[PDB]
């Protein structure tokens, strides 16, 4: 039925057309924040945090981490059916979860913090990471198969003081799991030549803006560096969690990222939380050390504020942006599908677009003009060998919504 995007699927329309050939279907029906979606091998992992009252200043009511199957719901439309749910005892201590599928389970790596979000209280946070393993098909009377909690004791960080999962989902290679992650490096140990800051033709930029933008504020104690957290399951005895820093090609501040397999190769997306507002994604050259051949995309960006609005390419000192990933659905033409926010300085107007590096092939809005939106997570797969995509979109009971979009074969309705 539902399988991974691998092999050689049905044709997708490769021409650019204004025709309405994308038909999004809503498959989902007090605030709900911090969402997480992952789709792998016909299964899915989902997570959220339900708060009471406000979304930012509200009390944490319940943290949900579940897994299940992606099935044909009946009318040839894929949907998600929960099969195994888990809730921590204190919802306000679990942060920054990231789910990676392997064979029988989803392994979700989360951070444990009694000082709030480690991104906003980095220096105070004492690094504590947990692993919750959830079976995609639970079995009765089966011990720790269905749900298993593992407090991670051994972590190798290299030059970084602290490391944390930072992204919705990672990949598996053989028996080794890789989670999107970030490392906190003190600015005193941050060796960066300002010569590498691309200030050319930028009238009001300074070569210092890159290094200062590598932190949440210009005087931050840490800089954030994206990368991977590696967990080798073959080393069964006690598995060390190893940090792998991302290469410094087109370096931007550590931000929520995603590594996913598509057409049998790894692809990486990194959210643009700084001055480089054009979308950052591409095929992975090497996983260890992590280097990504970023696409030179000139059509997809993200909303910002005053300093770094959408389409900005000059280095400024800013920490602003949103996570809006994209899934590669055709490597031979490097075509991708994802939801972007169609606004320069406000997080709003979600639009699902199928696009190449230098052109948007075809798109469709997901809500009215004034509708506010935030993080979006898009994962694509095959249903009876037609490419489908499921997108989680935060939208303003403030709660996320899930859409299923089939990628059409022809360019006319």
């Amino acid at each position, epitope marked *: 039925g539902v399988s991974d995007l691998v092999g050689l699927p049905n044709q997708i329309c490769l021409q650019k057309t204004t025709s309405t050939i994308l038909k999004p279907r809503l498959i989902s029906y007090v605030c709900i924040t911090d969402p997480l979606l992952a789709v792998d091998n016909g299964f899915f992992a989902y997570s959220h945090l339900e708060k009471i009252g406000s979304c930012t200043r509200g009390i944490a009511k319940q943290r949900i981490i579940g897994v299940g199957e992606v099935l044909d719901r009946g009318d040839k439309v894929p949907s998600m059916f929960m099969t195994n749910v888990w809730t921590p005892p204190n919802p306000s201590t679990i942060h920054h979860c990231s789910s990676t599928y392997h064979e029988d389970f989803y392994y979700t790596l989360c951070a444990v913090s009694h000082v709030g979000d480690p991104i906003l209280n980095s220096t105070s946070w004492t690094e504590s990471l947990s692993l919750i393993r959830l079976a995609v098909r639970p079995k009765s009377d089966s011990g720790d198969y269905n749900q298993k909690y593992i407090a991670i004791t051994k972590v190798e960080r290299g030059k970084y003081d602290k490391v944390m999962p930072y992204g919705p989902s990672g990949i598996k290679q053989g028996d080794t799991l890789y989670f999107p992650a970030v490392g906190f490096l003190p600015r005193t140990e941050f060796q960066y030549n300002d*010569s590498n800051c*691309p*200030i*050319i*033709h*930028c*009238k*009001y*930029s*300074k*070569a210092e803006n890159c290094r200062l933008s590598m932190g949440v504020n210009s005087k931050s104690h840490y800089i954030l560096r994206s990368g991977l957290l590696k967990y080798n399951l073959s080393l069964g005895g006690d598995i060390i969690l190893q940090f792998i820093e991302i290469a410094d090609n087109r370096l931007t501040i550590g931000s929520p990222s995603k590594i996913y397999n598509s057409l049998g190769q790894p692809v990486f997306y990194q959210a643009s939380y700084s001055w480089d507002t*054009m979308i950052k994604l591409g095929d992975v050259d090497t996983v260890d050390p992590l280097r990504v051949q970023w696409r*030179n*995309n*000139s*059509v997809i960006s993200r909303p910002g504020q005053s300093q770094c609005p959408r*389409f900005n*390419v*000059c280095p400024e000192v800013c920490w602003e942006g949103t996570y809006n990933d994209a899934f590669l659905i055709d490597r031979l033409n490097w075509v991708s599908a994802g939801v972007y926010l169609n606004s320069n300085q406000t997080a709003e107007n979600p639009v699902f677009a199928v696009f190449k*590096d*230098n052109e948007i092939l075809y798109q469709v809005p997901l809500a009215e003009d004034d509708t506010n939106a935030q993080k979006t997570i898009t994962d694509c797969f095959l249903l009876e060998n037609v490419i489908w995509c499921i997108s989680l979109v935060e939208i303003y009971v403030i709660r996320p919504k899930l859409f299923a979009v089939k990628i059409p074969a022809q360019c006319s309705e």
Partner: antibody
Framework: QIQLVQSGPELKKPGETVKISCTTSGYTFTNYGLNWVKQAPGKGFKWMAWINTYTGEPTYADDFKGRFAFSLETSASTTYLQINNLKNEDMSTYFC??????????????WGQGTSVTVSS | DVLMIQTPLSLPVSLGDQASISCRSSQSLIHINGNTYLEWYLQKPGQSPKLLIYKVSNRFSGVPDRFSGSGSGTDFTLKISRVEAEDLGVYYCFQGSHVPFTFGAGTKLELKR
């Protein structure tokens, strides 16, 4: 009335230092940056650097790090290219050209007349 | 490194003919801002170069309409419809999309006899 004028020809021995000037007139100096380009005799052009006349910060190619220095004086509306520890591979004709910021046209529309630098013992 | 390959290095043409110079890049010259900073310059003997064409196809001030530019991504062409004697010289393509900015080897437009 837009014109860029460079310093005269230079004849130097290996190891010495040369400083080529490029004085511009006829436009607002800070509204367009400058490009330094190098042409070897009977050969092609090599882009050396681009200087931001508003901030003073240059962006140079990797081959021209170290003994090359790209500075400017805003009062005189001049940019300077200084080469230290001259070697034979520096003998060439050096041009300055007007290259705009992203706010307009970054193409090299107005050029200097060029400055020849001969290096020999 | 981004490489600019010009064809041909020497282009003998009779006066009043059409000339075509091809420039191909090792990587796409479409910057991530949508612009393709491919420029064509001309240099006459004993003269500083002169900007002919900017952004693939736009003509700089004072350039005759007989000069035109076309292409996209990695393939570009400069075209002279009817070559007057004032066009004899050396034509260079140039890319300003990736640092370090690079030139072509050049094409010598000379007179056939």
């Amino acid at each position: 009335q837009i014109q860029l004028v460079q310093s005269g020809p230079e004849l130097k021995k290996p190891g010495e230092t040369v400083k080529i000037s490029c004085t511009t007139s006829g436009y607002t100096f800070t509204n367009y940056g400058l490009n330094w380009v190098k042409q070897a005799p009977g050969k092609g052009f090599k882009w050396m650097a681009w200087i931001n006349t508003y901030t003073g910060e240059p962006t140079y190619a990797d081959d021209f790090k170290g003994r090359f220095a790209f500075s400017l004086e805003t009062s005189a509306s001049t940019t300077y290219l200084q080469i230290n520890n001259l070697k034979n591979e520096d003998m060439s004709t050096y041009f300055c050209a007007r290259s705009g910021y992203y706010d307009g046209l970054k193409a090299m529309d107005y050029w200097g007349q060029g400055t020849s630098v001969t290096v020999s013992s | 490194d981004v490489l600019m390959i010009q064809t041909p290095l020497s282009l003998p043409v009779s006066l009043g003919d059409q000339a075509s110079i091809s420039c191909r890049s090792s990587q796409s010259l479409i910057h991530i801002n949508g612009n393709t900073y491919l420029e064509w310059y001309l240099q006459k003997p004993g003269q500083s170069p002169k900007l002919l064409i900017y952004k693939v196809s736009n003509r700089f001030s004072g350039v005759p309409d007989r000069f035109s530019g076309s292409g996209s991504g990695t393939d570009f062409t400069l075209k002279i419809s009817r070559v007057e004697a004032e066009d004899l010289g050396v034509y260079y393509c140039f890319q300003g999309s990736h640092v370090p900015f690079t030139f072509g080897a050049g094409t010598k437009l000379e007179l056939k006899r």
